[PDB]
């Protein structure tokens with residue numbers, strides 16, 4: 001898998017901004033949103049990965065993800081928490 | 082004022098109170114995707130107890146649906162029944178009358194003063210598919226009808242106002258219109274309304290921009306009388322490379338569709354910049370690179386005279402004057418005299434050698450390039466010159482550029498030649 | 513004379529406000545599943561490979577990322593409104609992250 | 617303008633508390649009275665409250681200065697206060 | 708209770724995460740208690756700013 | 763005004779005097795760019811005199 005950060009396409013991030021009540025979108029903002037999404041995903045994925053590695057498992061389950069998110073003060077309801 | 086023709090106009094077609102559909106599938110909003118969760122405005126019903134009128138969703142209210150061009154539906158919205166955003170459904174048209182003036186046919190006039198952004202009248206007609214539109218268009222072209230009666234409701238769906246419709250079909254095109262057509266959503270359907278772009282007073286004609294796609298049809302001359310008129314009815318070009326300068330002006334320079342194609346094809350396709358279609362800015366390089374051939378047609382001479390009366394560019398006038406220098410047909414020159422070419426040449430001189438947007442050497446070259454055909458044209462009376470008094474301009478410019486002695490001597494020879502010509506009579510008037 | 517009059521285009525903001533209402537009324541996922549899954553796998557590859565990712569974990573990650581982005585865009589819209597603008601810029605994103613404490 | 621930078625440099629280099637002790641003490645007692653009467657207070661609890669409130673107000677003023685900077689201004693306004701509080705999550 | 712009421716305004720007999728998110732976010736004290744939680748498939752409350760609208 | 767029909771066809775003026783009538787109409791409207799040989803301007807002038 002090689003540089004699929006472009007998979008978060010411009011209409012999709014436009015939709016995500018549009019849900020927040022934003023009327024106009026600058027042309028330079030898309031790289032910034034991709035960067036912050038990469039940072040957030042990086043942190044949560046890192047925490048989930050070390051949770052899985054402590055559990056002596058090779059597959060990340062939903063429980064590790066919900067645990068990592070709740071440990072960052074971003075508690076998620078609906079996935080067996 | 083002009084006599085009312087409202088009933089006479091009404092008798093020409095089957096009056097409709099609402100849009101008719103070829104079938105139940107056409108004209109549905111969201112391409113037929115029924116939005117069961119219809120967009121309900123959160124407005125509270127504001128009933129004036131005196132008049133019994135529900136003032137909710139008014140013009141100066143904050144109704145979200147009104148802003149988003151969606152009409153409230155009774156029994157589904159919190160605004161209640163008979164709100165102020167049911168203009169299409171209640172059919173509350175502005176009061177209008179039909180009359181006739183200038184070269185136009187029937188036309189619509191305002192029977193009362195109409196506010197800005199106010200709904201005027203719903204464009205009515207039969208909703209038809211593309212094939213039915215093509216068949217009706219072919220039938221009308223066979224019938225020789227000289228009037229547009231088709232509007233695009235949306236992609237693949239048109240509205241015909243020929244045999245059945247409303248008063249809106251009599252609205253005439255204006256290149257500086259006071260009204261405009263807009264698309265709105267009423268329930269699960271799409272409507273086309275006409276709204277006031279500005280404040281319109283009683284008796285004034287109501288007009289909108291047609292922005293007409295010709296679909297390959299020939300141009301029709303525009304007689305709206307607006308100062309900003311382009312002279313023909315149309316819209317956006319069907320492709321790039323189609324025009325660089327306005328037709329009359331382009332054909333005045335000897336350029337045609339092929340010569341306007343060739344320049345853009347040679348540079349734009351080879352990584353050199355040509356701007357979009359806009360005649361407000363003249364591209365001097367195209368005019369310099371254009372080829373020039375002598376004029377032998379009087380309609381081309383009329384187009385040249387129109388270009389002189391319209392174009393302000395130095396380079397276009399230079400190349401037109403050069404083309405006239407190549408031109409030596411006496412009949413075209415007599416036509417230019419009838420068109421009063423001297424009158425236009427006076428302004429062409431004045432703008433360049435009295436107003437100074439250029440360099441003195443280049444203006445001198447221009448003056449030497451424009452005195453020659455003035456010396457060469459056939460002249461038989463000072464009454465030709467009297468329609469322009471271009472001699473006065475010649476005196477002013479020889480006095481301003483007195484240091485450039487060839488121009489002065491040529492103007493001396495020119496005024497000496499013109500001074501000897503005969504004169505023609507003007508009937509004396511009582512005093 | 514068989515030409516057609518065009519319906520012209522909408523004003524800037526009308527279709528924007530329409531789609532604002534449409535996306536704030538509906539609840540489906542706005543990020544495509546497969547590119548987001550590939551992105552998650554790309555981020556996870558950098559630490560230790562041969563890591564299988566259950567569908568529920570990917571869905572939870574997608575939901576959390578969408579919630580975070582929506583909240584950040586709400587804050588950035590507030591920032592843009594404060595600066596007498598209606599268009600959000602990256603400087604508002606950076607300022608929102610700064611005041612939120614996510615960026616030092 | 618010069619004395620503004622002098623005050624900024626002096627207070628950013630100093631470490632003593634800037635809120636006066638006795639009015640803050642009376643404010644704490646007045647606030648605590650309406651939850652329960654006849655309340656006693658240790659001095660160290662009042663000092664801890666003063667230090668925490670001063671740190672919180674300094675952080676709020678820094679974020680408010682950032683908000684004021686955003687709007688091409690140099691003067692802080694109440695709208696900056698509620699913008700910082702709204703974004704930070706207080707109600 | 709609040710979720711069933713919010714469903715009742717939506718003319719629905721099925722409680723979904725959307726109604727739960729509506730019930731939580733529209734009540735001040737419940738929003739205060741459940742501040743830092745994201746409801747899966749809950750969506751966002753409709754909120755358009757006043758000066759964002761045209762004139 | 764340049765059309766096939768003519769204003770003076772509804773009068774008692776003979777067709778040999780149509781240019782005479784148009785010169786009268788043009789000179790009465792104080793026009794000065796008019797030339798006798800320009801029939802178009804004559805027709806425009808008489809049209810604006812009889813049907814302003």
Ligand SMILES: Nc1ncnc2c1ncn2[C@@H]1O[C@H](CSCC[C@H](N)C(=O)O)[C@@H](O)[C@H]1O
Nearest residue numbers: 186187227228229250251253254303304305
């Ligand atoms: N400004 C204008 N100049 C010339 N013709 C115009 C015009 N505006 C409209 N038209 C003509 O009117 C047509 C639209 S239908 C308008 C009503 C019609 N003229 C009638 O009286 O029955 C156009 O296709 C064109 O032929």
Ligand SMILES: [Zn+2]
Nearest residue numbers: 122124138144
């Ligand atoms: Zn309403």
Ligand SMILES: [Zn+2]
Nearest residue numbers: 138153160164
């Ligand atoms: Zn309403």
Ligand SMILES: [Zn+2]
Nearest residue numbers: 256303305310
């Ligand atoms: Zn026109």
